[PDB]
A paper describes a structure:
The next step is the formation of the indole moiety, which is catalyzed by [name] ([name]; the product of [name]). This reaction comprises a ring closure of the substrate 1-(o-carboxyphenylamino)-1-deoxyribulose-5-phosphate (CdRP) into the product indole-3-glycerol phosphate (IGP). The [name] structure has a canonical (βα)8-barrel fold with an additional N-terminal helical extension comprising two α-helices, α0 and α00, of which α0 forms a lid over the active site. In this work, we have probed the structure and mechanism of [name] from [name], because it has the highest reported turnover number of all [name] enzymes characterized to date.
The PaIGPS–[name] complex crystallized in space group P21212 in a large unit cell containing eight enzyme molecules per asymmetric unit. The substrate analog, [name], is bound in the active site of the seven more ordered chains. [name] is enclosed in the active site by the helix α0 and βα-loops 1, 2, and 6. The suggested catalytic residues (Lys123, Glu172, Lys63, and Glu61) adopt similar conformations and identical interactions with the ligand [name] as in the SsIGPS structure. In chain B, the same conformation of [name] does not fit the electron density, and the ligand instead adopts a conformation where the C2' hydroxyl is shifted 2.2 Å toward the general acid Lys123. The observed movements in the C1'–C2' region in some chains are possibly coupled to the position of the guanidinium group of Arg196 on loop 6, which adopts an “inward” conformation and interacts with both the ligand's carboxylate and phosphate group in chains B, F, G, and H. Chain G lacks density for [name] in the active site. The helix adopts an open conformation in chain G, where—through domain swapping—it covers the active site of a symmetry-related molecule. Moreover, the disorder of these three regions reflect their innate flexibility in the apo state and suggest an induced fit mechanism of substrate binding. However, in PaIGPS, there is a phenylalanine on active-site βα-loop 6 (Phe201), 4 Å away from the anthranilate of [name], whereas in EcIGPS the corresponding residue is a leucine. PaIGPS has the highest reported turnover, and from structure-guided mutagenesis we find that an active-site phenylalanine is responsible for its high activity compared with other [name] enzymes, possibly by guiding the rate-limiting condensation step.
Author numbering: 3 to 266
Amino acid sequence: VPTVLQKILARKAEEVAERRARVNLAEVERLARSADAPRGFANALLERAKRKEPAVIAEIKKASPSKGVLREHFVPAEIARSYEAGGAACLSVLTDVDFFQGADAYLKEARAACALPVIRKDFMIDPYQIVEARAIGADCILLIVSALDDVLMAELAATAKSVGLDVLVEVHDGTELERALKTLDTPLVGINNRNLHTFEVSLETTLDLLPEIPRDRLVVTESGILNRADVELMEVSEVYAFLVGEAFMRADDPGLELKRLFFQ
Ligand SMILES: O=C(O)c1ccccc1NC[C@@H](O)[C@H](O)[C@H](O)COP(=O)(O)O
């Protein structure tokens, strides 16, 4: 529905077709069976959150639709190592090329550089992309409720499980939340505080949904985390899992900014 999302998804269908033409599904499936074992993306968040410790998914993002270029000097392996040293639980690596100035290679490089699990941050609309995520070494994929009907969403999640990927489902409102909870049993329920129609950010997007989130799910609050008051708000509300990019991409030492926001 969101205009920018429609444009991304239209492009995404083209890119999938183009890649499938060059590398067909059977080959991507062979590469996925051969990849390094998944590192346990959900487990890494769950083991910290259950101890009331910050579970930070640190995001490697060169540019974005809402902000333009976020980091001039962009070396994924170095960002990954800084993130790990600063206390991140997992990484998020944008692999979308035309809207986030990302690349699949950035995920391979970030993952090889550290021992943390990595979510492929991209726009999944086709089982091909899910199998491909595992072939490039991802430990988790992203499903965006705004972008999917329920049957397709269940199908993509089932494809992910069958290649050993964890699933992060992202919602923006109560209607999307209830579709996600009814359709998927992943524990990882991501709430995006950034409205994709206006690009406005509200941390209360997360807080207002907590009364509908079962205790067997883990809330991952996404976007808008910029300062320590934001972190305090979430932790007092018993939100311990975060997806954060801009706050770190604007800093000289991204891992140090992570330590300053979460571990002092
Ligand atoms: O950030 C954007 O401009 C944007 C635009 C269109 C679609 C999705 C978008 N962002 C996806 C969102 O998951 C963010 O990359 C992460 O939540 C990290 O947010 P940040 O901490 O950088 O505000």
